[PDB]
Amino acid sequence: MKTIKMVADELNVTKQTVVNNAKNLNISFEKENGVNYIDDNDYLKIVEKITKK
Amino acid sequence: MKTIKMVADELNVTKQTVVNNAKNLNISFEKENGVNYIDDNDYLKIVEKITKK
DNA sequence: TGTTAGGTACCTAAC
DNA sequence: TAGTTAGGTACCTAACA
Predict the structure, then answer these.
(1) Are B29 and B37 in contact (CB under 8 A)?
(2) Which residues partner with B36 through β-bridges?
(3) Nucleic strand C within 7 A of Cβ A19
(4) Cβ neighbours of residue A12 under 8 Å, at least 6 residues apart?
(5) Distance in Å, residue A17 CA to nucleotide C2 C1'
(6) Distance B51 CA to C5 C1' (A)
(7) What's the CATH number for B2-52?
(8) What's the alpha-carbon Rg for chain B, to the nearest Å?
(9) Rg (CA), chain A
(10) Which of A2, A33, A49, B39 would give a disulfide with A38, using CB separation of 3.0 to 4.6 Å?
(11) Can you tell me whether residue A36 is helix, strand or coil?
């Protein structure tokens, strides 16, 4: 439901920063018609990690 | 020898415009490492089509 | 161990 | 109908942290 860009802009980081933290958390994206989507559970965990640090 | 960026910088045109003219001219790039290269003969043809138009 | 900026490859909607 | 640009998508890494 959330794309990388949507997440990146809520957190005010670059898209690659979203991708870098998603890989630190060994989160994997769902690709639909070529575009990554972040599941709502994985979303929260990404924001928690970018927020704390 | 030439990358898409190099040619697009010479002609003061975007990279996709180089690619669009290359497909018009049935010009095949050579991809290595993950980077397209244009030989000088094909390179000569792209400048002709872009600068005449 | 981390961001960002700036590269690479592609695509298409709007002029 | 036939361009071009801008702005998206995916992915990578050097430089500065």
Answers:
(1) yes
(2) B31
(3) no
(4) none
(5) 9
(6) 31
(7) 1.10.1660.10
(8) 10
(9) 10
(10) A2
(11) strand
Distance CA B9, CA A45 (A): 42
Q: How far is the CA of B17 from the C1' of D5 (A)?
A: 9
Q: Which two tokens stand for residue A43?
A: 């979303």
For residue A10, what are its two tokens?
A: 């809520």
Task: Give the type of residue at A52.
Answer: K
Looking across all nucleic acid strands, the nucleotide with the smallest C1' to CA distance from residue A49 is C2
The experimental method, as deposited, was X-ray
- What DSSP string runs through B1-53? -EEHHHHHHHTT--HHHHHHHHHHTTPPPEEETTEEEE-HHHHHHHHHHHHH-
Q: Cα separation of A22 and A36, whole Å?
A: 12
Reduce the DSSP state of residue A29 to 3 states and report it: coil
Resolution (Å) of this entry: 2.2
